[PDB]
Nucleic acid binder design. Structure first.
Length: 1227
RNA sequence: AAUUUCUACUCUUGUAGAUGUGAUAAGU
DNA sequence: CTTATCACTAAAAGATCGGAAG
DNA sequence: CTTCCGATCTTTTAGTGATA
């Protein structure tokens, strides 16, 4: 019995609020007089300049330490091979522990505990590892200790400039602890060495050994290219791809040399040699090309290397291009292209579509041309292996121009000669048109973009030829193309820089962190650390103040604020109390002091501690062995239970440690005032983590106390305290609407209900930033014209729960299995509606379908329509592109509220569109997969902690009890099918589909081009007849026919009754007349669509065609043999055109506005479904048709949960299963 | 067209929604 | 342009300065 | 007049659980 309102308080979530600080009183004058802001700006500059020096010393220590490892590597290779062959859990954990011990073994080199080094160098490396992550790297100790590093006097002087202030680097310090650690983190050098580079090197070795087993005739060729490249001259080819040589390959420059050997010098590499071998088309070419024939390069090592401004840069670029005469070289190359041999120069395969998009009319016509011409040149009968050989020989291989000019004819030799005679001419204009004076007028940006794109299209035409010498290419043409390529390669870089400059923003959001000459400013608010951190907050009359007390004449003037009776006028100051993360402080303040470990070496008696204790606390020896053992897993850790299985001694030691913790909690002078009667006794705890997760919320407390106003006023006036007012738009005097969500979090954090029972915790690690001025009347950009102080503070919501969600999917599947009647929301994008919603019931009937064009009754469809018009109205308009892309993000940010409101009201499971396994065209408003990915991520992050503004604080959904329905976001690929209530289903076969019987277009088209193909396609049907009672053409289709021309996705039923409906008038529910069965088809000119749309009436056109042919059909007889006997091309062409028009599900015309669907199949009731009927029980528009089938896919996933005994979904549903399920349920 | 920040407007010197900040790596 | 990491800290420990004593 | 011992400011430091 799990209620939907019980899906709250499951895991903590960390958020961060930001506010603006107004300097109250005359603290602005004090800050300006003392000059903190200029000093902090100079120090931020020094920190930015000092970061690469610390990176340099880390780099040289990493290289020096990695050059000494001689580890042996067969064991992890055996482990990963055992995983590859078995794929069981036992070998999986064996591989995991083998990777862990390899990372530990290589980390022993950094920490200097390696078994295979002597003691002196071990002590040297251990001292270096100790001294890297302390202040000893700043004063100059480890600089002399390393010896290798070279530092000039300026870098050294700015490196010692952080003296007595080193902790400014502290997070950065711990950031570098990510790199050198032995953990499984992706930024670890051991992880990069073991789990990333080594699998690629091992598989490189295996492909090399297998390919040298196949034939050794190219082993000498490998030796010659290794000698000619002059890379790794001290070793042969056989041992450079062996495992022990990886012990020399860990350094970055050796990785670079390995990559240079594999890829060549830009002189051929191994990949180019293999390409030359497989392109020869001898027996060795088939014996190697059927085999794996690639070596993927290794990853780089961590921390390793490899308006007038743009106007002047482009002016110098154009002047240098005019001096080099790149247009003259290009026109000379295009002139000599007309006479040289075309066999010796090749076209890169990556633009095999692109040439089809440029030199001809369709983006894949020349690919089909060369494929069918290779098929026509095949010797013997066509088989599967020969077809696959042809497909392989044309899929990823460069092709010379003679095959292009023979398959596609000589006509391209004119058209190509046309197109270059355009582009270089504009390039000539781009090298003749003068530079614009500024970039503030529209025409200046116009002429600038034209100057970029002509030369950019010239690059994109020069990318056509195969720049890689994978075939036999004469080197002088290669030299000329590469020279003119490298003369003007960076034009893409100036294009990107000009686009991002003209795109970004007109403001300067750059800010630097203020510190007020404090090492640890606003790191914590606790009243014992109130002196050093110097950050407090006051509350008065609903307003919130931040007080920062700086050091006075170089010393912390310990000003004390006195308690005051409440009704006296004054600020309210908190008394923050925290014992941070008791799992790590209870070791810290007991059994890990220097005194206790110094005593426990030479003694066995228990030790009594009486420092910061009200009574002497006793530490016996056994608890010291429990916390500090010989091995890494402690006795009371569950890793000991997993590794050994001795549960009895585990439970006894856990009880002893838990008793010691409970004894400790009552006598430390900070935690003595806390009530611990809320804890269950020691023996009732299953493990240790639950104890710490329940104990941690008990140790944090905020209590307000009244401070006299006069003392604060003289503290501000004197200069001992800097008082700022915390501000956003909700603390203004004219504020009367609903607040922002962060203001709701901030107000609910200091509510009395939260102060009594902590649900939101005010975290430490606050930051103060400063932003310069950035250079009734409503002034544009008021917040961006003045220098401003910002305040960034993190908070932790749902503090009473754990940190990790554990099995969120299991819990939500349990709730969904408990409740079968739960509705399903389906979300789907479309044309003429940006986002479309369909909330359906469990039985399949829709409950509410809507378009999300309108938000606050002032719809965004006209915004996208108008902005997309002005896109065209001024070219592409670099300026407007960004406004469109941000209006899309803002539209999605407003759509988030509508979706979570629908989910909350309907208590439903939402079902989104999976962006993998899918392709979406243009015209869908939001199309870009990155923008919708950002949407799905924003939705997951919003439903991670869902809170509504109008809800009460105490109720579920309020600030003190937010809704948590979705698991924490981790990756765009590790989502799977579900994340809590966020279900994902594959995109296609959801928009163009009959919503009542599930008919889909079974043929694959764009292959109806040859005449006998049309003959076989038309002969595939069973029979066509005419009915005079309804005046319709009934054509019968069997799914076992036209299998070569049908898609390979059979449905449930094999029968279909396609109907050409009488194209008469009809009435909807609203009485608006509409022609029944009419279709919309584009007009085609020069075998290409032109965008203009025309209306088609299939039955009337077929009547006209058949009476013009003189075919008698009023008897109800078959017409297909009555028309195929003449073998007329025009008749079969019109028949195919009418079949395509009839099978066209969607019909839209944005110029006139109508948009509908039309199923050409009679249902079980014999009617033909028309979405222009506007039946509320069926999808209104085509976007509703898409969203309803997305919701039905979610319903299918729900049923897949229901039949399964285990509480887990199936994976992504195959399309054949979806079609079978739909055509089984609906018929 | 006013915003801690973004989007979009002006009955209202503001409105409706969203907003995890800072830092460093790595991939294309 | 994405994917992974870490911090969200008070108290112990040690450097720094100033006063007392031989 | 120099050296040793006590206040003050800065800087390290401890580390729990659980599958995919």
């Amino acid at each position: 019995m799990t209620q939907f309102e019980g899906f709250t308080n499951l895991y903590q979530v960390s958020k961060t609020l930001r506010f603006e600080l107004i300097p109250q009183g005359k603290t602005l004058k004090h800050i300006q007089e003392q000059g903190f802001i200029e000093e902090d700006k100079a120090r931020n500059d020094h920190y930015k300049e000092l970061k690469p020096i610390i990176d340099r010393i880390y780099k040289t220590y990493a290289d020096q330490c990695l050059q000494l490892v001689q580890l042996d590597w067969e064991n992890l290779s055996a482990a990963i091979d055992s995983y590859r062959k078995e794929k069981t859990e036992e070998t999986r954990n064996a591989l995991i522990e083998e990777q862990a011990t390899y990372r530990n073994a290589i980390h022993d080199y950094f920490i200097g505990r390696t078994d295979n080094l002597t003691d002196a160098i071990n002590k040297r490396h251990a001292e270096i590892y100790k001294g890297l992550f302390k202040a000893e790297l700043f004063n100059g100790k480890v600089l002399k200790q390393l010896g290798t590093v070279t530092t000039t006097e300026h870098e050294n002087a700015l490196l010692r400039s952080f003296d007595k202030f080193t902790t400014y680097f502290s997070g950065f310090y711990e950031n570098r602890k990510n790199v050198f650690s032995a953990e499984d983190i992706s930024t670890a050098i051991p992880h990069r060495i073991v789990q990333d580079n080594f699998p690629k090197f091992k598989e490189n070795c295996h492909i090399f050994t297998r390919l040298i087993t196949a034939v050794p005739s190219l082993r000498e060729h490998f030796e010659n290219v290794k000698k000619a490249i002059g890379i790794f001259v001290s070793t042969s080819i056989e041992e450079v791809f062996s495992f022990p040589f990886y012990n020399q390959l860990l350094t970055q420059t050796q990785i670079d040399l390995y990559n240079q050997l594999l890829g060549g010098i830009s002189i051929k590499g191994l990949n180019e040699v293999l390409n030359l071998a497989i392109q020869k088309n001898d027996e060795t070419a088939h014996i190697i090309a059927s085999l794996p024939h690639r070596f993927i390069p290794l990853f780089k090592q961590i921390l390793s290397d490899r308006d007038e401004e743009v106007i002047q840069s482009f002016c110098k670029y154009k002047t240098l291009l005019r001096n080099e005469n790149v247009l003259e070289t290009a026109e000379a190359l295009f002139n000599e292209l007309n006479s040289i041999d075309l066999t010796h120069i090749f076209i890169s395969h990556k633009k095999l579509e692109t040439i089809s998009s440029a030199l001809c009319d369709h983006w894949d016509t020349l690919r089909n041309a060369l494929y069918e011409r290779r098929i026509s040149e095949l010797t013997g009968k066509i088989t599967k292996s020969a077809k696959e050989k042809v497909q392989r020989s044309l899929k990823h291989e460069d092709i010379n121009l003679q095959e292009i000019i023979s398959a596609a004819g000589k006509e391209l030799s004119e058209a190509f000669k046309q197109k270059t005679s355009e582009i270089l001419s504009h390039a000539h204009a781009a090298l003749d048109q003068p530079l614009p004076t500024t970039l503030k007028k529209q025409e200046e940006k116009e002429i600038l973009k034209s100057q970029l794109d002509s030369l950019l299209g010239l690059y994109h035409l020069l990318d056509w030829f195969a720049v890689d010498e994978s075939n036999e290419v004469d080197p002088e043409f290669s030299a000329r193309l590469t020279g003119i390529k490298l003369e003007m390669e960076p034009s893409l870089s100036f294009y990107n820089k000009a686009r991002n400059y003209a795109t970004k923003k007109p403001y300067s959001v750059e800010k630097f962190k203020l510190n007020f000459q404090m090492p640890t400013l606003a790191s914590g608010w606790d009243v014992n650390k109130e002196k050093n951190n110097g950050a407090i907050l006051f509350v008065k009359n609903g307003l919130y103040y931040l007080g920062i007390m700086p050091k006075q004449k170089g010393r912390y003037k310990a000003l004390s604020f006195e308690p005051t009776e409440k009704t006296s006028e004054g600020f309210d100051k908190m008394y923050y109390d925290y014992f941070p993360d008791a799992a790590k402080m209870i070791p810290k303040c007991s059994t890990q002091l220097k005194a206790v470990t110094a005593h426990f070496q030479t003694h066995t008696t228990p030790i009594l501690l009486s420092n910061n204790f009200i009574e002497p606390l006793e530490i016996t020896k056994e608890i010291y062995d429990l916390n500090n053992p010989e091995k890494e897993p402690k006795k009371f850790q569950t890793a000991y239970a997993k590794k050994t299985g001795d549960q009895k001694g585990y439970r006894e030691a856990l009880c002893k440690w838990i008793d010691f913790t409970r004894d400790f909690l009552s006598k430390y002078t900070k935690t003595t005032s806390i009530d611990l009667s809320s804890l269950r006794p020691s023996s009732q705890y299953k493990d240790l983590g639950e104890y710490y997760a329940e104990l941690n919320p008990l140790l944090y407390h905020i209590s307000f106390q009244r401070i006299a106003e006069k003392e604060i006023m003289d503290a501000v006036e004197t200069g001992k305290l800097y008082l700022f007012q915390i501000y956003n738009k909700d603390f203004a005097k004219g504020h009367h609407g609903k607040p922002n969500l962060h203001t709701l979090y901030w107000t609910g954090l200091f509510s009395p209900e939260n102060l009594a029972k902590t649900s939101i915790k005010l975290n430490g690690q606050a930051e103060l930033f400063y932003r310069p001025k950035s250079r009734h009347e409503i002034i544009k950009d008021r917040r961006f014209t003045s220098d401003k102080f910002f305040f960034h503070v993190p908070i932790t919501l749902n503090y009473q729960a754990a940190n990790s969600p554990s099995k969120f999917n299991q819990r939500v599947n349990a709730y969904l299995k408990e409740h079968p009647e739960t509705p399903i929301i389906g979300i789907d994008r479309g044309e003429r509606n940006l986002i479309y919603i369909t909330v359906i019931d469990s039985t399949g009937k829709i409950l509410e379908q809507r378009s999300l064009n309108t938000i606050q009754q002032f719809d965004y469809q006209k915004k996208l329509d108008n902005r997309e018009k002005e896109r065209v109205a001024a070219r592409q308009a670099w300026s407007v592109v960004g406004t469109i892309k941000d209006l899309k993000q803002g539209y999605l940010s407003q759509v988030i509220h509508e979706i979570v409101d629908l989910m909350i009201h309907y208590q439903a499971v939402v079902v989104l569109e999976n962006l993998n396994f899918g392709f979406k065209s243009k015209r869908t408003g939001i199309a870009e997969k990155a923008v919708y990915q950002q949407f799905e991520k924003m939705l997951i992050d919003k439903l991670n902690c869902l809170v509504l503004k109008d809800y009460p604080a105490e109720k579920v959904g309020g600030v003190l009890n937010p809704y948590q329905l979705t698991d924490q976001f981790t990756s765009f690929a590790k989502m799977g099918t579900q994340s809590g209530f966020l279900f994902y289903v594959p995109a296609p076969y959801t928009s163009k589909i009959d919503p009542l019987t599930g008919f889909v277009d079974p043929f694959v088209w764009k292959t109806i081009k040859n005449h006998e193909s049309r003959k076989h396609f038309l002969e595939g049907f069973d029979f066509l007849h005419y009915d005079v009672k309804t005046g319709d053409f009934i054509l019968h289709f069997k799914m076992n026919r036209n299998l070569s021309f049908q898609r390979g996705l059979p449905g449930f039923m094999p029968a279909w009754d396609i109907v050409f409906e009488k194209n008469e008038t009809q009435f909807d529910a609203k009485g608006t007349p509409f022609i029944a069965g009419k279709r919309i088809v584009p007009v085609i000119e020069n075998h290409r669509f032109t965008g203009r749309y025309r209306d088609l009436y299939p039955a009337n056109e077929l009547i006209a065609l058949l009476e013009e042919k003189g075919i008698v059909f009023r008897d109800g007889s078959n017409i297909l043999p009555k028309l195929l006997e003449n073998d007329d091309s025009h008749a079969i062409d019109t028949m195919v055109a009418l079949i395509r028009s009839v099978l066209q599900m969607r019909n839209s015309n944005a110029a006139t506005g109508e948009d509908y669907i039309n199923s050409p199949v009679r249902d079980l009731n014999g009617v033909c479904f028309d979405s222009r009927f506007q039946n509320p029980e069926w999808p209104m528009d085509a976007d509703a048709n898409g969203a309803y089938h997305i919701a039905l896919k979610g319903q299918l996933l729900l049923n897949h949960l229901k039949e399964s005994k285990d509480l887990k979904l199936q994976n992504g549903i195959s399309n054949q299963d979806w079609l079978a399920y739909i055509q089984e349920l609906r018929n």
